Write a protein that binds this ligand. Structure first.
Ligand SMILES: CC(=O)c1ccc2cc(N(C)C)ccc2c1
Length: 257
């Protein structure tokens, strides 16, 4: 779109857009195959692999961890090094708060970034490139591919776990519920969607003004939209503006509504 190019101009940023209406197969694309650091959006796919692995009862497994597992941002995990946390609780904290220690513990449990990669390849994702813990500070730079993905691949993988057959329905329900009750995305995709429509989302933030959000958006009646809005900027220490994500989403909704 001229419309997306305008937003890149207004915000001095690079935009990556992919949206699929699952009820019509209509598509919205703008740099859909351009790579961006996936950042915390990977937490969503990590839980997908986690669920696939485990049974639902197995998620009640208690993980004991230490202060040495605490990283830069540990809003839930810092409160329970005494008690530990169950895998289910770690998935909650990772998805809904973007608790970084929680993600690290879950990654360890699934066998690390190498194992996460191997599992994403198995579900048909050849693009997404998990390599490191804390993705995210790698880093990296242009135009290296470690810990990156594209708007297309993230949509395709999110859809696979959340909506298709990479998971049985009761595990689907957990992932979707956690993402619906995300606390970190109010100013992003959620702010670009019409009022009262349910949204499941996972946010990401990285250097180079990288600000990301992947989402499933249910219209009142009928089939959901799966969307990835990715963004980055020129300078390593550039700041992002959440408003870019909300406005991009508005453009996407107009192109499909
Ligand atoms: C887990 C971890 O060690 C870590 C450390 C620093 C981080 C800085 C970020 N931004 C400056 C956006 C984002 C994620 C980060 C994660």
């Amino acid at each position: 779109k001229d419309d997306f190019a305008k937003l890149e101009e207004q915000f001095d940023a690079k935009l990556g857009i992919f949206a699929l209406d699952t009820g019509t197969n209509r598509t919205v694309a703008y740099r859909p195959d351009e790579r961006f650091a996936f950042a915390s959006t990977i937490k969503a796919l990590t839980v997908g692999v986690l669920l696939q692995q485990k049974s639902i009862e197995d998620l009640n497994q208690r993980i004991t961890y230490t202060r040495d597992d605490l990283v830069n941002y540990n809003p839930i995990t810092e409160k329970h090094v005494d008690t530990g946390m169950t895998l289910k609780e770690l998935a909650d904290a990772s998805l809904r708060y973007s608790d970084n220690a929680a993600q690290n513990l879950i990654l360890k449990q699934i066998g690390g970034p190498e194992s996460l990669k191997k599992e994403l390849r198995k579900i048909g994702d050849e693009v997404t490139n998990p390599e490191r813990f804390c993705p995210e500070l790698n880093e990296v730079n242009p135009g290296e591919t470690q810990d990156t993905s594209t708007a297309r691949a993230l949509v395709t993988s999110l859809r696979a776990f959340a909506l298709e057959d990479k998971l049985p329905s009761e595990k689907r329900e957990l992932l979707i519920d956690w993402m619906k009750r995300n606390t970190t995305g109010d100013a992003l995709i959620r702010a670009g969607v019409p009022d009262g429509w349910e949204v499941a989302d996972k946010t990401g933030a990285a250097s180079y003004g990288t600000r990301n959000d992947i989402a499933i958006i249910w219209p009142p009646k009928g089939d959901p939209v799966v969307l990835a809005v990715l963004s980055s900027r020129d300078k390593k220490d550039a700041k992002y503006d959440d408003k870019l994500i909300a406005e991009a989403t508005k453009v996407v909704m107009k192109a499909l509504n």
